[PDB]
Design a protein around this ligand. Structure first.
Ligand SMILES: [Cu+2]
Ligand code: NA
Length: 639
């Protein structure tokens, strides 16, 4: 099930309009309170007008609207199920503006919702762009509008949330398709559940930021239910999905051909392991006792060229285990892995003990000391997040999480780890005064400017329960060593939520739930627009443009020359992300040093160490003196 974020608005005073309505199926059947009666557009002998179809409500007064619900026809017939849709709000009835929510609803008879940030309005309009099966009708048994207890205007200068993208599934795992710019999301064998999978199938969905189209596709070619997996973008730019519901499988997503390819089976069955791309394009994984059995799962490495998984038995998982009260089932999960120099992998946590993993020969592991600072040794931080915001300086920001996977209080701990050469003990300090809000199950992304956006989570980890939610996101500004609260959102994003940086510089945050009959499934995502995209007036700022790129494919050590339309002050390269269960081992940022060639022409070199400039796809962003970033240019970094 799902749920709206507000309380139902009284339908007494409403006035509704429909594009068409067949007698027996009047506009008002949708607001009678009877689930047996429904509005239905013209059919048969009234003709069959194709969608779009529209449902407009006049609440007569101004309500602080935060959502709507749509109960499809409950008579067993599917005709008229809304697929693609848009939701608009208006205080006047003539000026709608941009949709407050849009996307596609799954093809079933369950009540569907549109949850969105609170906006005073008197008029609401639901546009049915498509019928779920491609037919021309639109039918609605019941329609409700929800209101917030109050309305609090976003504060200027603190970012903005919206719109809401409605999806057919709970996006508990997502990736950006680098060649297309689309967001790829997946659930499990079902749109809203993973328990009871016959294994072998995964439901996916994609959102295209350019067209606003949400599409769904079932993947069975790899015979893998991809819930709870390791995810890494390999050296070739293929996304490597491992284990989870089908514990030994490997599935490859090729952005180029937009297809799924069966990969080789891992040597050890795992679920909830983290995998990390290496300086050589290979993928290392360790741990993962969620599925495949509970025992010590040492390292293994995938080679994209030979398409083999090789065991690395001496890359021992033992030193990275947390002290989880549930034991090994949780203690080897979601490692904070980072590919580094010379085939090494750094594990920053969640255990207090940090380690160096080596992939030569049969593997090795060396202690890197304890995450700690002048405030003491950091406790285990299961589901805390770790982000490499400056790969050149080896800087990793870690934050949040709790000692145990669940039933444990999250903390405000935050540290900065600075990596040197593999085998050396990195320096760790405390970050500022820690998070404003203790959280676990939160997600984060590094932004073009090197700041880290942190959002969602809860104060006490309770999977599938939307309790103690943190609605206020925070940004860490490394240059100032300061955290800043941002404007709050209205949708809880806790266990099974995700965040990804979009190529336009905005953040896509969504998911949460995936517990079948629970009412905590969130079949949506919201967009957060950081203040760097607005000018002083609250309007969107004018962005620099990258008019030319000497090349779109470069070897580490290589130079790229660009021309822009305005003088730029800074540039950064951001590796494309993948995310699930708080883990994102693919994102990282490299700040660039620019050579001004005069005439708004600039060159830069990609770092020559492929353990810094990990191979794969990256986003190039340039910023003007104002700090406004361009939309990214996609660059492929090869070794
Ligand atoms: Cu899970
Ligand atoms: Na009705």
């Amino acid at each position: 099930a799902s749920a709206p974020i507000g309380s139902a608005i009284s339908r007494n005073n409403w006035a509704v309009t429909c594009d068409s309505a067949q007698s027996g199926n009047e506009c008002n059947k949708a607001i009678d309170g009877n689930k047996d009666t429904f509005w239905h557009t013209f059919y048969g002998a009234n003709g069959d007008p194709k969608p779009p179809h529209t449902y407009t409500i006049d609440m007569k007064t101004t309500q602080n609207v935060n959502g709507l619900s749509m109960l499809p026809r409950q008579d067993g017939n599917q005709n008229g199920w809304i697929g693609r849709h848009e939701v608009y709000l208006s205080s006047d009835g003539t000026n709608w503006g941009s949709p407050v929510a849009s996307g596609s609803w799954f093809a079933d008879s369950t009540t569907k919702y549109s949850n969105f940030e609170t906006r005073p309005a008197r008029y609401v309009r639901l546009v049915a762009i498509t019928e779920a099966n491609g037919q021309p009708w639109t039918s609605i048994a019941e329609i409700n509008v929800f209101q917030a207890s109050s309305y609090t205007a976003p504060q200027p200068g603190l970012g903005r949330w919206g719109p809401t993208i409605d999806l057919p599934i709970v996006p508990a795992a997502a990736a950006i398709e680098p060649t297309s710019g689309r967001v790829l999301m997946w659930s499990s064998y079902r749109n809203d559940a993973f328990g009871g999978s016959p294994g072998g199938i995964t439901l996916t969905s994609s959102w295209d930021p350019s067209t606003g189209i949400v599409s769904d596709r079932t993947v069975t070619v790899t015979k893998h239910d991809m819930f709870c997996p390791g995810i890494s973008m390999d050296g070739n730019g293929q996304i490597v999905v491992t284990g989870g519901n089908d514990a030994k499988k490997t599935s490859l997503y090729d952005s180029s051909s937009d297809s799924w390819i069966p990969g080789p089976d891992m040597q050890v069955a795992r679920g909830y392991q983290s995998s990390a791309t290496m300086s050589d394009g290979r993928v290392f994984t360790i741990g993962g006792s969620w599925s495949g059995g509970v025992f010590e799962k040492n390292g293994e490495v995938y080679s994209p060229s030979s398409k083999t998984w090789t065991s690395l038995p001496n890359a021992k998982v033992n030193p990275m285990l947390t002290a989880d009260k549930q034991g090994l089932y949780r203690s080897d999960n979601h490692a904070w892995l980072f590919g580094w120099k010379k085939g090494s992998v750094f594990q920053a946590g969640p255990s207090t003990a940090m380690n160096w993993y080596y992939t030569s020969g049969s593997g090795d592991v060396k202690s890197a000391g304890k995450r700690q600072s002048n405030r003491g040794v950091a406790p285990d931080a299961m589901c805390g997040n770790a982000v490499m915001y400056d790969a050149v300086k080896g800087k990793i920001l870690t934050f949040g999480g709790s000692p145990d996977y669940q039933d444990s209080d999250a903390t405000t701990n935050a540290h900065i780890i600075t990596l040197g050469e593999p085998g050396t003990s990195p320096n760790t300090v405390f970050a500022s005064n820690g998070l404003y809000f203790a959280r676990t199950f939160h997600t984060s992304v590094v932004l073009p400017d090197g700041s880290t956006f942190i959002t969602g989570g809860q104060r006490r980890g309770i999977p599938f329960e939307d309790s103690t939610p943190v609605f206020t996101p925070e940004i860490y500004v490394p240059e100032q060593d300061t955290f800043y609260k941002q404007n709050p959102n209205s949708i809880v994003r806790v266990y099974h939520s995700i965040s990804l940086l979009l190529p336009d510089g905005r953040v896509f945050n969504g998911g949460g739930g995936l517990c079948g009959d629970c009412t905590t499934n969130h079949f949506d995502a919201q967009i957060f627009t950081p203040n760097y995209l607005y000018n002083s007036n609250g309007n969107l700022a004018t962005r620099p443009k990258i008019t030319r790129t000497s090349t779109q494919s470069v070897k580490v050590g290589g130079r790229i020359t660009i021309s822009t339309d305005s003088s730029i002050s800074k540039a950064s390269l951001i590796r494309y992300g993948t995310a699930t269960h708080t883990v994102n081992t693919d994102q990282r940022r490299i700040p660039l040093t620019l050579t001004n060639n005069g005439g708004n022409s600039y060159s830069f070199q990609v770092p020559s160490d492929s353990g810094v400039a990990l191979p794969g796809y990256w986003m190039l962003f340039v910023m003007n003196s104002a700090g406004v970033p361009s939309v990214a240019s996609t660059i492929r970094v090869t070794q």
